[PDB]
Amino acid sequence: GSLTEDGLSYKEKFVVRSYEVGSNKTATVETIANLLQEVGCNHAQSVGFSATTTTMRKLHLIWVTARMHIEIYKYPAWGDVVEIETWCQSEGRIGTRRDWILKDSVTGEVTGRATSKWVMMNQDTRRLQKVSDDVRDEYLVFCPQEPRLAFPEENNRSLKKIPKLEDPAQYSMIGLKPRRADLDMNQHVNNVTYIGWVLESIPQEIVDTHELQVITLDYRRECQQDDVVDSLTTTTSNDSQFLHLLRLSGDGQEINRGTTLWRKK
Amino acid sequence: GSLTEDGLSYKEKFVVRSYEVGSNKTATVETIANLLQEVGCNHAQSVGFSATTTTMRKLHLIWVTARMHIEIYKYPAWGDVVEIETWCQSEGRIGTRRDWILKDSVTGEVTGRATSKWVMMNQDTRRLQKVSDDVRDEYLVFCPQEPRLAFPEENNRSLKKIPKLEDPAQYSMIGLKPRRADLDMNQHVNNVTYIGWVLESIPQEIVDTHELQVITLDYRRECQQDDVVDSLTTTTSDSQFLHLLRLSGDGQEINRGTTLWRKK
Numbered sequence: 032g033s034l035t036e037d038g039l040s041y042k043e044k045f046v047v048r049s050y051e052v053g054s055n056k057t058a059t060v061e062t063i064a065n066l067l068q069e070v071g072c073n074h075a076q077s078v079g080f081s082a083t084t085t086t087m088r089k090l091h092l093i094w095v096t097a098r099m100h101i102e103i104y105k106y107p108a109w110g111d112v113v114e115i116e117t118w119c120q121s122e123g124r125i126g127t128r129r130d131w132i133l134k135d136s137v138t139g140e141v142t143g144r145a146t147s148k149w150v151m152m153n154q155d156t157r158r159l160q161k162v163s164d165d166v167r168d169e170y171l172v173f174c175p176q177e178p179r180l181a182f183p184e185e186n187n188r189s190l191k192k193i194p195k196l197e198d199p200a201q202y203s204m205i206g207l208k209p210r211r212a213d214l215d216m217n218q219h220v221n222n223v224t225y226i227g228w229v230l231e232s233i234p235q236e237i238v239d240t241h242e243l244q245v246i247t248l249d250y251r252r253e254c255q256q257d258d259v260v261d262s263l264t265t266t267t268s269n270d271s272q273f274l275h276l277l278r279l280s281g282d283g284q285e286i287n288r289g290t291t292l293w294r295k296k
Numbered sequence: 297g298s299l300t301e302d303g304l305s306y307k308e309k310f311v312v313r314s315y316e317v318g319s320n321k322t323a324t325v326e327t328i329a330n331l332l333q334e335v336g337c338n339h340a341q342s343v344g345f346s347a348t349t350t351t352m353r354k355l356h357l358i359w360v361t362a363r364m365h366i367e368i369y370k371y372p373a374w375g376d377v378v379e380i381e382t383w384c385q386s387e388g389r390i391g392t393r394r395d396w397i398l399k400d401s402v403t404g405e406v407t408g409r410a411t412s413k414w415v416m417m418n419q420d421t422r423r424l425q426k427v428s429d430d431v432r433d434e435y436l437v438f439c440p441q442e443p444r445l446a447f448p449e450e451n452n453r454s455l456k457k458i459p460k461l462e463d464p465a466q467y468s469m470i471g472l473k474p475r476r477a478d479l480d481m482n483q484h485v486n487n488v489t490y491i492g493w494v495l496e497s498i499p500q501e502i503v504d505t506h507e508l509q510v511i512t513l514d515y516r517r518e519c520q521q522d523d524v525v526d527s528l529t530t531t532t533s534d535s536q537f538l539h540l541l542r543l544s545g546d547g548q549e550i551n552r553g554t555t556l557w558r559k560k
């Protein structure tokens with residue numbers, strides 16, 4: 032992988048692995064999400080991070096995902112080479128945004144796109160906060176100054192408000208728990224695990240006859256290593272749409288909410 | 297990746313990813329196991345198995361893992377390049393064996409080694425069988441003829457008999473279930489998931505103060521997508537553990553194993 036010529040974006044190529052694919056011999060949405068995370072991390076590293084700035088480490092602040100939005104046109108097959116370009120942009124004092132473009136390395140065609148919203152939070156108290164000028168000036172030199180959006184369209188799905196699923200849910204998958212493979216290097220549940228948990232309450236027949244085109248996920252609260260999660264889904268819809276809710280098994284505390292759009296094969 | 301000069305083994309390099317590492321910023325044993333599986337699949341593809349041969353497909357036969365043995369001296373760090381060499385060998389009528397050698401690409405030193413036993417099975421009835429000479433001759437042209445062992449030493453850990461853990465277990469993790477990410481392209485639970493499940497009953501304090509040096513796992517029966525598993529561990533000792541994976545309900549054995557851990 033490498034930063035582009037202007038140093039304002041990063042590209043990396045990946046060869047799709049045997050264990051990374053599902054029944055159609057194409058990459059699952061969780062493999063795609065893992066690759067987006069890996070290219071994001073390689074971009075932060077190439078521009079001097081170890082992505083907390085100098086001022087952020089001093090003040091015990093971190094970037095946390097508030098929303099993830101992915102749209103896939105074609106999932107790459109086992110052994111195929113996918114090229115992913117990523118970049119960041121400041122969204123004023125609200126936080127930051129990281130976008131991605133997925134391309135087939137052989138044809139050069141766009142096969143997918145993603146966008147994410149990140150908010151600043153104190154690592155210890157979990158208290159959200161706005162972005163100060165001191166922090167903003169430190170990461171602006173690594174961002175394109177003019178807007179560059181993976182989802183430019185005026186009324187696109189990435190900025191839609193997601194409602195809270197009402198009980199009773201049409202479908203459910205109960206008692207989901209993270210294992211050590213689900214944790215990141217800091218012992219927190221990896222953000223991609225939540226995507227997997229949301230998808231667990233979709234019936235196998237839908238997965239067997241449809242392809243996931245779009246997923247939008249809001250991150251409200253994190254699941255601890257010793258927490259248990261319930262995954263809830265209700266059909267809201269040639270295309271099928273679903274409303275999703277992840278909540279703690281006991282008290283029913285919301286951890287995530289989301290929507291998926293699926294097209295018939 | 298590519299076959300070596302003689303075409304009797306395969307090498308591939310991997311750059312360790314951010315999500316592939318644990319708390320020490322080094323690859324977990326499950327990442328290592330995934331890489332061994334990937335290089336194994338790439339070897340089979342390079343020699344024409346787009347690893348079932350022509351005769352196996354007609355007779356509805358597949359290779360299934362009976363045992364996996366891994367020894368790690370150094371886990372590669374996040375961003376490091378690891379080189380893995382793999383090869384296969386016939387073990388007469390019993391089945392086949394696949395071995396691996398892990399090396400640090402920069403230093404060239406051996407950082408790990410692995411060996412696995414595979415048995416022939418009818419994919420529909422799940423009935424084990426011996427290897428026929430028709431099948432044996434079809435894969436012998438892809439194997440070194442003289443023995444080449446990742447674990448040569450006489451009386452070594454890879455061939456030790458593993459006993460069945462007796463109730464009550466010292467430690468346990470119950471109600472483990474596979475999710476879709478745990479399944480392979482054929483909708484079966486990936487072999488690496490069982491390694492993860494075995495490790496779930498090891499206490500976090502042991503994981504926080506020790507490094508896993510050796511793991512031996514016997515595969516008795518598969519866990520279906522709708523099955524629930526209980527993971528059981530007892531200290532037998534460096535720290536050694538005896539492991540048992542069984543179905544949550546009837547208590548049917550799926551795996552048994554042992555782990556050896558060194559203090560950091």
Ligand SMILES: Fc1cccnc1N[C@H]1CCCOCC1
Nearest residue numbers: 064067068071072096099222223
């Ligand atoms: F770029 C990242 C660096 C570190 C962590 N996550 C990143 N990106 C997203 C991965 C895909 C699923 O959504 C969550 C976040």
Ligand SMILES: Fc1cccnc1N[C@H]1CCCOCC1
Nearest residue numbers: 329332333336337361364487488
């Ligand atoms: F070479 C392989 C091809 C396909 C599947 N597994 C392979 N190898 C081992 C993977 C890691 C531990 O489980 C034992 C088998």
